[PDB]
Amino acid sequence: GIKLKRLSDKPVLMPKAENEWERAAVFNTAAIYDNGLFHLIYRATDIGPHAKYGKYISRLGYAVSKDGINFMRLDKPVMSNETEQELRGLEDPRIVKIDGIYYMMYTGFGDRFQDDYRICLATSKNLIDWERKGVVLDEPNKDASLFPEKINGKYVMLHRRYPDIWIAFSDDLKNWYDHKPILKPIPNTWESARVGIGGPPIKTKDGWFLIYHAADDNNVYRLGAVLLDLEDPSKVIARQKEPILEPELGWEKEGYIPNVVFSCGNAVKDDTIYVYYGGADTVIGVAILEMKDIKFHH
Amino acid sequence: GIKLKRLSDKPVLMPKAENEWERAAVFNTAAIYDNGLFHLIYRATDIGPHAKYGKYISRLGYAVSKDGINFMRLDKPVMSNETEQELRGLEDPRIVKIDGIYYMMYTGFGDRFQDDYRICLATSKNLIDWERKGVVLDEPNKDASLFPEKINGKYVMLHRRYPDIWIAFSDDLKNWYDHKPILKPIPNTWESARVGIGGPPIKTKDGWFLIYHAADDNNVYRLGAVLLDLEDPSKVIARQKEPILEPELGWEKEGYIPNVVFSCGNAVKDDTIYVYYGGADTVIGVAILEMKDIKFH
Numbered sequence: 001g002i003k004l005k006r007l008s009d010k011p012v013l014m015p016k017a018e019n020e021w022e023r024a025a026v027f028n029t030a031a032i033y034d035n036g037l038f039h040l041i042y043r044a045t046d047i048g049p050h051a052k053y054g055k056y057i058s059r060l061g062y063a064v065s066k067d068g069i070n071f072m073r074l075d076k077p078v079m080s081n082e083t084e085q086e087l088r089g090l091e092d093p094r095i096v097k098i099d100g101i102y103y104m105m106y107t108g109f110g111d112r113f114q115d116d117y118r119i120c121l122a123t124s125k126n127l128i129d130w131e132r133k134g135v136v137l138d139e140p141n142k143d144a145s146l147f148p149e150k151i152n153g154k155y156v157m158l159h160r161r162y163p164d165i166w167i168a169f170s171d172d173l174k175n176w177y178d179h180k181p182i183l184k185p186i187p188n189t190w191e192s193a194r195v196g197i198g199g200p201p202i203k204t205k206d207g208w209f210l211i212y213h214a215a216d217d218n219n220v221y222r223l224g225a226v227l228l229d230l231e232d233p234s235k236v237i238a239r240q241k242e243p244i245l246e247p248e249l250g251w252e253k254e255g256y257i258p259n260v261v262f263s264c265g266n267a268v269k270d271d272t273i274y275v276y277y278g279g280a281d282t283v284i285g286v287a288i289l290e291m292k293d294i295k296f297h298h
Numbered sequence: 299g300i301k302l303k304r305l306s307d308k309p310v311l312m313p314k315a316e317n318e319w320e321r322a323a324v325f326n327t328a329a330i331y332d333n334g335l336f337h338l339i340y341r342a343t344d345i346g347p348h349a350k351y352g353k354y355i356s357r358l359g360y361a362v363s364k365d366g367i368n369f370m371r372l373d374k375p376v377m378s379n380e381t382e383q384e385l386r387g388l389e390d391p392r393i394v395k396i397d398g399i400y401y402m403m404y405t406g407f408g409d410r411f412q413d414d415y416r417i418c419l420a421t422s423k424n425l426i427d428w429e430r431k432g433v434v435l436d437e438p439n440k441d442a443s444l445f446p447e448k449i450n451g452k453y454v455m456l457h458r459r460y461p462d463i464w465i466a467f468s469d470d471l472k473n474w475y476d477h478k479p480i481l482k483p484i485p486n487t488w489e490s491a492r493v494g495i496g497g498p499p500i501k502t503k504d505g506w507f508l509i510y511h512a513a514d515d516n517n518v519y520r521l522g523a524v525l526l527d528l529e530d531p532s533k534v535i536a537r538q539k540e541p542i543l544e545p546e547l548g549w550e551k552e553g554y555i556p557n558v559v560f561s562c563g564n565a566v567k568d569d570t571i572y573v574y575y576g577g578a579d580t581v582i583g584v585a586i587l588e589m590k591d592i593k594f595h
């Protein structure tokens with residue numbers, strides 16, 4: 001079945017000692033192909049991203065590439081910790097573009113009380129200047145994105161009421177309705193502990209192609225794939241049994257958080273999907289999948 | 299008359315010692331407002347830009363800003379020294395946008411023989427990925443730009459056959475015709491030694507507003523202003539006698555090349571012109587002019 005193919009045995013982006021805001025880790029990046037270029041909005045921390053290392057703050061950087069492998073990067077974050085909901089920063093952005101506007105959903109980590117993390121929304125026309133729209137769902141939640149277009153006149157979002165992937169609908173992005181779970185962990189497998197989306201889903205002629213992540217009972221993170229019905233994305237057409245990507249290389253297995261591959265971004269150019277992923281919550285790699293190779297076992 | 303007003307008493311961009319390609323100087327930048335942002339394509343050198351320091355190489359960097367004062371910058375040049383005409387790099391870019399395409403004219407400095415510098419053209423849709431189109435005029439020349447639109451069906455360019463500003467016309471950017479001088483130095487003034495354009499001209503209801511630079515007989519560089527006729531830009535309607543900008547601050551007067559202000563870029567947002575300029579061939583500053591204040595005596 002479906003296996004992602006690494007474009008490089010080295011990371012495509014790494015932390016930068018000279019800049020405090022991204023000195024420790026760059027990971028879990030949004031990705032989009034636009035106007036002839038691959039664009040990354042990447043999560044970056046000043047400290048290793050676990051409480052055992054310290055009070056890490058996540059900020060969002062910008063990088064750009066012609067080929068999807070070799071990146072140039074801006075020296076300052078395009079979004080920084082500004083609100084109370086963002087006391088400990090902004091995490092794990094997912095971006096789609098609808099009618100000339102980029103919609104980014106990210107985790108605002110406050111850590112003022114138990115489960116003080118919230119899905120937040122920001123919009124942009126240019127990926128540099130972001131306007132905050134506030135909390136999307138006022139509840140402990142993350143792993144969220146819009147679908148890249150309206151379905152039957154409505155905005156559609158994926159979210160993650162622990163430990164399951166959920167879907168919901170909205171007329172205006174302000175109020176959400178028709179919440180329902182669509183994907184759950186499976187006991188005694190690689191995907192037993194929890195599930196959550198990767199990057200935003202991608203429209204194909206056979207359905208919505210959605211990459212997801214899961215953790216096993218040792219907290220090893222891997223990626224998998226599902227296909228959702230076009231008109232009712234709450235309906236799962238197919239779910240591949242085996243992972244599409246697992247920690248294999250040294251920088252996937254070792255880092256601040258061991259044995260993690262984790263995606264928040266899948267850019268598309270000429271029928272090739274470029275899946276960007278965090279390795280060990282420390283660096284960013286890329287792996288590809290050609291659209292024609294999206295096949296689920298009949 | 300017309301005076302540019304500095305937005306800051308500090309530079310808006312400075313060299314960055316940790317990157318070789320822009321370690322010593324950033325200056326003489328293109329500038330354009332697009333999609334809610336100010337964009338700079340800046341000239342950068344690895345060492346002080348004078349022969350006494352060595353064989354400096356110029357490369358082109360990218361910077362971006364919401365407000366036109368505070369910039370973020372990419373870590374690598376968007377264009378580097380690649381051809382024989384660019385042995386010593388790429389200098390002094392001027393950019394305009396026509397029908398979704400950015401046209402950048404820059405100096406390719408080869409230094410293989412006397413006067414081995416040529417106006418070259420590159421195009422982009424995104425300001426990051428540039429496609430070389432080659433030499434524009436095969437002759438010693440610089441200080442060049444397209445006009446930001448076609449006039450009577452034709453591309454129009456400014457150039458500088460030393461020491462005068464010239465104009466020329468083209469159907470296709472490949473062959474040029476109707477070369478004519480439009481602006482010359484004036485003896486016993488601040489603009490006695492030579493003249494050349496600043497950034498691309500800006501369309502006004504009264505004519506084409508063109509910032510130019512000049513050097514005096516001590517090689518002090520200042521900016522001035524002219525107005526050209528809309529339909530025949532070879533015709534000068536007005537020329538201000540006094541400069542619009544001169545070296546005054548420490549980082550304009552002192553640096554690798556003393557007493558220089560030099561512009562290759564003027565971005566426009568909501569009827570305000572943002573004139574970016576090199577100071578002392580070392581750093582970049584910005585000064586503004588509101589359209590309503592464009593008045594000639």
Ligand SMILES: OC[C@H]1O[C@@H](O[C@@H]2[C@H](O[C@@H]3[C@H](O[C@H]4[C@@H](O)[C@H](O)[C@@H](CO)O[C@H]4O)O[C@H](CO)[C@@H](O)[C@@H]3O)O[C@H](CO)[C@@H](O)[C@@H]2O)[C@@H](O)[C@@H](O)[C@@H]1O
Binds near residue numbers: 390460560
């Ligand atoms: O520094 C002010 C601006 O100078 C021009 O570009 C520089 C250079 O100009 C040529 C010539 O250069 C002299 C001397 O002025 C210069 O300091 C040294 C540097 O090693 O070389 C000398 O030959 O000066 C003439 C008088 O204006 C000028 O017409 C010549 O083109 O040209 C080289 C190659 O193109 C360039 O690297 C230098 O920067 C301007 O075009 C701006 O670039 C400078 O701001």
Ligand SMILES: OC[C@H]1O[C@@H](O[C@@H]2[C@H](O[C@H]3[C@@H](O)[C@H](O)[C@@H](CO)O[C@H]3O)O[C@H](CO)[C@@H](O)[C@@H]2O)[C@@H](O)[C@@H](O)[C@@H]1O
Binds near residue numbers: 091107
């Ligand atoms: O969004 C805030 C932080 O959430 C984290 O995930 C938590 C929770 O984290 C656990 C550990 O798995 C984690 O390594 C350490 C880091 O200090 O904190 C613990 O509380 O794990 C559950 C299950 O996956 C999530 O539902 C929670 O959101 C990480 O994602 C951090 O990166 C993030 O800053």
